[PDB]
Structure formats: structure tokens, C-alpha cells
């Protein structure tokens, strides 16, 4: 209809198979004509951890006020092929809505609290190839209603 007309693309800014941080960066464009609540969009990047460790992650950037967007980790249960973890993104309700016909970018960074490596090769999520916003199914978001873009593993 025109509720979840929520379009994702996606890059990685780092691409470095063996890294200590992961930078996924997102675009979200509302192609239906009514806005879209940002309280109520979730994204997903799946990987395999590689080392379990307390991780962080930081919003550097999004139109949206960067102290709107945080992360959380959560396990995979099974675990599968390229993910046994995802970072879910959340907006807080200060994000505000997002128009029709318009996007905003969300980049951010995460790693573990030693700062120990990834490997990014085998993450489920990661584009090795892309060097701007491509649009890819191996994210994945969300609204209130559940899944609306992507596969998840
Ligand atoms: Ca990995
Ligand atoms: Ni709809």
C-alpha cells in the first residue's frame, strides 16, 4: 500500500578484510507520498563476530541528530552461515519523521572493547565491492509492523 514504502541502500566506508572497527552506512529514502515515523525503524547488520567481546557502537553521523540513532548486539539463535551476531540500529522518537520523496544517511562505526580484530570476509552483511550506496538485500529493516526490507539469514 503506502506504510512501510521505506527504500535501504547500504555500503561499508571500511573494507579492510582483517579490521578493528566495522562502518556500516546506510541511506533510507521514503518512496511513498505519506511520512514515515523514524521511532519506529529499526535496521539490521549481521556478521560473525570472530571473538566475542563487549561492543559499542557510535553514530558519527545522520541529518537526524546523531545522539538519536543507537545500536545494540544481539546473538544469532542458531547461529548460520556469515552471522552468528547483528547490530540492531534503533531512532529514539526525537529522530522525527522522515518525508516523503526524501532520505537521510546514517553512518556509523562499531568494535569491541579491546579493540581486538574482525574479520569482515565472512559477515554476512558486508560488501567487500560497494564504494557507495548500493541497494542491498543482506541488511535488513524494520517497523512497527516487523521485516520491510532485505533477507535475513
Ligand atoms: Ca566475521
Ligand atoms: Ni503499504
Given at each position: 500500500?503506502?506504510?512501510?514504502?521505506?527504500?535501504?541502500?547500504?555500503?561499508?566506508?571500511?573494507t579492510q578484510a582483517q579490521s578493528?572497527?566495522?562502518y556500516?552506512?546506510?541511506?533510507?529514502?521514503?518512496?511513498?507520498?505519506?511520512?514515515?515515523?523514524?521511532?519506529?525503524?529499526?535496521?539490521?547488520?549481521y556478521f560473525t563476530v570472530d571473538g566475542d567481546k563487549?561492543?559499542?557502537?557510535?553514530?558519527?553521523?545522520?541529518?537526524?541528530?546523531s545522539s538519536?540513532?543507537?545500536?545494540?548486539?544481539?546473538?544469532?539463535?542458531?547461529?548460520?552461515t556469515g552471522a552468528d551476531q547483528y547490530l540492531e540500529i534503533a531512532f529514539s522518537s526525537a529522530a522525527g519523521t522522515l518525508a516523503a520523496n526524501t532520505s537521510i544517511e546514517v553512518q556509523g562505526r562499531f568494535?569491541?572493547?579491546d579493540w581486538t580484530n574482525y574479520n569482515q570476509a565472512d559477515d554476512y552483511s558486508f560488501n567487500s565491492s560497494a564504494t557507495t550506496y548500493t541497494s542491498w538485500d543482506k541488511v535488513t529493516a524494520?517497523?512497527?509492523?516487523?521485516?520491510?526490507?532485505?533477507?535475513?539469514?
Open positions: 500500500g503506502s506504510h512501510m514504502n521505506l527504500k535501504v541502500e547500504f555500503f561499508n566506508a571500511g578493528n572497527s566495522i556500516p552506512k546506510f541511506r533510507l529514502t521514503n518512496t511513498g507520498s505519506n511520512a514515515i515515523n523514524l521511532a519506529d525503524v529499526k535496521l539490521h547488520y563487549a561492543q559499542t557502537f557510535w553514530c558519527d553521523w545522520s541529518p537526524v541528530g538519536n540513532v543507537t545500536g545494540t548486539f544481539v546473538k544469532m539463535n542458531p547461529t548460520t568494535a569491541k572493547s524494520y517497523s512497527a509492523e516487523g521485516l520491510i526490507w532485505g533477507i535475513e539469514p
